[PDB]
Design a protein around this ligand. Sequence first.
Ligand SMILES: [Ca+2]
Ligand SMILES: [Hg+2]
Ligand SMILES: [Hg+2]
Length: 279
Amino acid sequence: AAQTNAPWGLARISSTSPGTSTYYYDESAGQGSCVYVIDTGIEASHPEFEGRAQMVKTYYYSSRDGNGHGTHCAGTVGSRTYGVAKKTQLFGVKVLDDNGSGQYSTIIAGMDFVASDKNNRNCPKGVVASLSLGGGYSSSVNSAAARLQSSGVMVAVAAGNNNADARNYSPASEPSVCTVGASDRYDRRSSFSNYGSVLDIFGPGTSILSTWIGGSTRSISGTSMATPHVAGLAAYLMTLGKTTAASACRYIADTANKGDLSNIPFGTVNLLAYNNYQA
Ligand SMILES: [Ca+2]
Ligand SMILES: [Hg+2]
Ligand SMILES: [Hg+2]
């Protein structure tokens, strides 16, 4: 299939070269897989989700996304127009408050929750978890991510927006998970993107158009925007049977666009998510 005039990030992900505008992809579009979006929540009622989204857990008074970025993230994962895996199932887990904040304790609980909950869902093709959040190093937060990963869920997490080494950030510093850095339209590392040996891959994260609360759309930037591209790509490949939850991150890196990025400091991988689609 082909999506003309797609958002830059989607096109990038299906091209060996920057500057294209069509998103090529397999019609299967991730049907059969499930992506948990651990964020501020999801405006499930957004027409872009086509009823493929559901809230399954909140740690606050309401299950609603009063922030928007959670909706944005989910959109990049599997919205009709803005998503990578256009036919995936989305489950929102509200660990962050309407201000976009959350306590380590809550975030951990949210991870333990997905590990369990997945057992009651029908996701024949696999389970993914997308975590566009983080903070200062914590061994417990890291540990929670590792458990989730070991439970059979493909865990994708943002590298952080400090323009620093991701080693001092959690759950970014957890080696067993998939740490995602940001890239811009010109194949440059995103100015704010964290880097370091702990990163596994880069995805598009500068000026990302996607869904927003109130049934609208919005373009924002961050390693937070890149993460969902990877989570989406993972769901997509899983339904294709190319890879499993345990080896997805490595499969993505193996098959990535190599050496295309600029502004990549020595010691950081130079790999860009790539779907390798061939009509
Ligand atoms: Ca890793
Ligand atoms: Hg987000
Ligand atoms: Hg987002």
